[PDB]
Amino acid sequence: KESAAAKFERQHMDSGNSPSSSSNYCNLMMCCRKMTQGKCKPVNTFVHESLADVKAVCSQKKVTCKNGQTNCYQSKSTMRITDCRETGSSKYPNCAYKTTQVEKHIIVACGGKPSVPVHFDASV
Amino acid sequence: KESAAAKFERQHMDSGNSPSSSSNYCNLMMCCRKMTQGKCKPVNTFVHESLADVKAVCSQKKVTCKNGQTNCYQSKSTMRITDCRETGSSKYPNCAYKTTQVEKHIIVACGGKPSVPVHFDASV
Ligand SMILES: Nc1ccn([C@@H]2O[C@H](COP(=O)(O)O)[C@@H](O)[C@H]2O)c(=O)n1
Ligand SMILES: Nc1ccn([C@@H]2O[C@H](COP(=O)(O)O)[C@@H](O)[C@H]2O)c(=O)n1
């Protein structure tokens, strides 16, 4: 059971960060979206275009998947995305990320019916 | 089980024009620090001062807690804090917060041995 002291630190303490930072985004979002539990997910991309635009990639250019499956698609246009990479200093449970704002084409794996993105493969 | 489509949205989608904006700090932090599960916590303060300074409040100005308990203390000096309050548009499970950076005195409840902050009572 979480201690009251620890609960206060969780709910109320942010000693180590600036609320006006633009580069703390990955640290917060990787935490928010549950990719820092058990271990730090080493690499993750967030896409800032509309969900409709991202879903539409599944109808765009067929390309090779990094894993050799044949269900990957590349966006016809570059998209606004954020690249999150673990830092050299990052050590679970203190997961630290470098945030990079990028405009690149995304490659996603699509699946399901309707065919929708199910995995983020690469940005190129 | 979380659907593949949902997993992609959780891991990879953050649609919007200014995702890393300082205005989004409360949205990200409230999510990361687990105050948006079940319902949106309406009001929450994050403190940007050293934990040493916040612990030191437990030996500062005694004040009655808002709820009538008698283990509250007010900081002698103001502290840099961020006030998170639900917007008029916020509705679970889409919690939305206005982020406001202010410098105010904090009032905390102190408990345990050693006596440390266990509850955030108010900012004044
Ligand atoms: N550019 C990249 C590369 C990988 N990833 C994420 O990392 C996961 C595994 O990637 P790797 O197989 O390349 O290590 C992918 O499913 C994806 O969620 C990403 O989000 N952006
Ligand atoms: N200024 C404030 C007011 C309330 N709160 C949080 O909201 C809870 C309830 O506050 P109220 O008593 O004002 O409704 C407190 O336990 C505290 O966690 C806060 O963090 N900062």
- Measured CA to CA, the distance from residue B71 to residue B74 in angstroms comes to 10
Q: Residue A28 is nearest to which of B28, B82, B112, comparing CB atoms?
A: B28
Can you state the percent helix, strand and coil of chain A, rounding each to 5? 20, 35, 45
Structure's resolution in angstroms = 1.7
What technique solved it?
A: X-ray
User: Binding site membership of A: which residues?
Assistant: 7, 10, 41-45, 66, 85
- Measured CA to CA, the distance from residue A13 to residue B85 in angstroms comes to 16
Work out the end-to-end distance of chain A between its first and last CA atoms, rounded to an integer number of angstroms. 45
Domains and CATH numbers, chain A: 1-124 (3.10.130.10)
User: Binding site membership of B: which residues?
Assistant: 7, 10, 41-45, 66, 85
Q: By the 8 A CB rule, do B49 and A15 touch?
A: yes
* Pocket probe mutation, ligand 1, options A45, A98, A103, A119, max atoms within 8 Å of Cβ: A45
Full strand arrangement of the beta sheet holding B116-123: B61-63, B72-74, B106-111, B116-123
- Measured CA to CA, the distance from residue B100 to residue A41 in angstroms comes to 31
* Pocket probe mutation, ligand 2, options B44, B85, B100, max atoms within 8 Å of Cβ: B44
